[PDB]
Amino acid sequence: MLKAGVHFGHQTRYWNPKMKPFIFGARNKVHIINLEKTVPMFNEALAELNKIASRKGKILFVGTKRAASEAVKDAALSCDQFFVNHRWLGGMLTNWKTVRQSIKRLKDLETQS
RNA sequence: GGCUGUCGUCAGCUCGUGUUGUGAAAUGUUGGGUUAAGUCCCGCAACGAGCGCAACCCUUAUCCUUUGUUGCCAGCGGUCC
Ligand SMILES: [Mg+2]
């Protein structure tokens, strides 16, 4: 029917009660999201995301999780956007005004070697 | 006032921004290694920075350059030696 063979679920008994209205089933202790009803969500964050993206807005991807770090840098910066696949950093957005220094440093430094 | 002793030549002491907490405060600055060292790296709701330790000052250990007088005396002779 749908491309579900590319996955099956994850987790087990740690989960979090916050998720319940969407449970495809339960096996091997690992819970399985009810993609059968997740269909709307599978596009929801895309539709209302289109107007934003199509509006040509700065893209902010985050893949600090080593389990897919570099495996996303491409689909991000290399994809004409931004990212942070490596290791996230505190204050990057909040203490932004401060991080600028460090950021502006990796630039004016490239001219080194 | 200015000056100085004192721990202490100790590696400490802080601050701005962000964030957590009602608040007093905390974080950083804690931690894993490492160093003479807040030394360096790694990690981290922290990001950075200021005073301080590490440098430049002196001086000694070498080698060269030049300058050779009052300093020097090797090859040359002289020589009251
Ligand atoms: Mg230091």
UniProtKB/Swiss-Prot annotation:
Query: Which residues are recorded as modified (N6-succinyllysine)?
Result: 107
Q: Which family does it belong to?
A: Belongs to the universal ribosomal protein uS2 family.
Subunit notes for this chain? Part of the 30S ribosomal subunit, contacts bS1. Some nascent polypeptide chains are able to cross-link to this protein in situ. In collided ribosomes contacts ribosome rescue factor SmrB.
What job does the chain carry out?
Answer: Required for ribosomal protein bS1 (rpsA) to bind to the 30S subunit.
Q: What is this protein called?
A: Small ribosomal subunit protein uS2
Which taxonomic lineage does the organism of this UniProt entry have? Bacteria, Pseudomonadati, Pseudomonadota, Gammaproteobacteria, Enterobacterales
Q: Whole protein: which stretch is covered?
A: 9 to 121 of 241
